UniProtKB/Swiss-Prot annotation, chain B:
Domain of life, per lineage: Viruses
Annotated effect of mutating E3K: In strain: Beta/B.1.351, Eta/B.1.525, Theta/P.3, Iota/B.1.526, B.1.1.318, Gamma/P.1, Zeta/P.2 and Mu/B.1.621; May enhance affinity to human ACE2 receptor
Impact noted for substituting H38P: Increased resistance to human covalescent sera neutralization
Location of this fragment in the whole protein: 482 to 529 of 1273
Entry protein name: Spike protein S1
Species of provenance: Severe acute respiratory syndrome coronavirus 2
Gene that encodes the chain: S
Function of the molecule: Attaches the virion to the cell membrane by interacting with host receptor, initiating the infection. The major receptor is host ACE2. When S2/S2' has been cleaved, binding to the receptor triggers direct fusion at the cell membrane. When S2/S2' has not been cleaved, binding to the receptor results in internalization of the virus by endocytosis using host TFRC and GRM2 and leading to fusion of the virion membrane with the host endosomal membrane. Alternatively, may use NRP1/NRP2 and integrin as entry receptors.
Result, substituting Q12Y: Reduced host ACE2-binding affinity in vitro
Effect upon mutating Y24H: In strain: Omicron/BA.1, Omicron/BA.2, Omicron/BA.2.12.1, Omicron/BA.2.75, Omicron/BA.4, Omicron/BA.5, Omicron/BQ.1.1, Omicron/XBB.1.5, Omicron/EG.5.1
Amino acid sequence: QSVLTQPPSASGTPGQRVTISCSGGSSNIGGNPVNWYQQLPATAPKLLIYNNNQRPSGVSDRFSGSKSGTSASLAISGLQSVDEADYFCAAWDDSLNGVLFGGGTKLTVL
Amino acid sequence: GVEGFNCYFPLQSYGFQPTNGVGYQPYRVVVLSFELLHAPATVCGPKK
Amino acid sequence: QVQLVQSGAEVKKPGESLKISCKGSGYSFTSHWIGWVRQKPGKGLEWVGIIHPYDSDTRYSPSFQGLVTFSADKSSSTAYLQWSSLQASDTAIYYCARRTDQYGSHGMDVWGQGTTVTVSS
């Protein structure tokens, strides 16, 4: 586990907009662009955001990212039960020469 | 995956010689980068 | 379909050798970095390394240098993660990862599906 502070527990009604904040050292997020990931439980992870905003194939338009230097934000608008998964702020970084991962963001509905 | 026709290595070697001119010579460079966030102003002394 | 395929659920004994396989198919194989990542269950996401298959150039985890053995063969289209010695900390779900270098960034868009190596006692 690397120095990438992430809220481990999120919640909200279906249709809400969560904001996952991520911060750390400036060699992590200030240097390399922040990426965002999502892993469903007992499954494989998948990338959501690269280049601070851009998404790969298979990623919905609800997930949007922003980088303010060392700080970062993932906005996910219009929640449903698909967000029962831990979301990672990660990047390939040259801090300790690794694809450094975050603390997860697992959400449930109530 | 192979290096061949229309597919070269992303890095090529420096051709650097003493016969090369000063514009075609290697320079040692440093980029001091600062960012103003709320933190202790770190490297501080030349003022008194 | 671009996919890094790991095998089924693996059972071995500690201390011995084991070379986990990861087939690369559906894409130009030696055109992206292949990342081996660990997931011990109940933890935040762990990193082991990432390897270019053309010359086995691995950007390592500086705290596991020499412990984990990396290899990735081009013509077999397979990344191989080997440990000459197995332990109780190896018991984890490992994943592969494909980097989206197709005119983009350093994110890992395609992943391995996950394979647990265990010892039963």
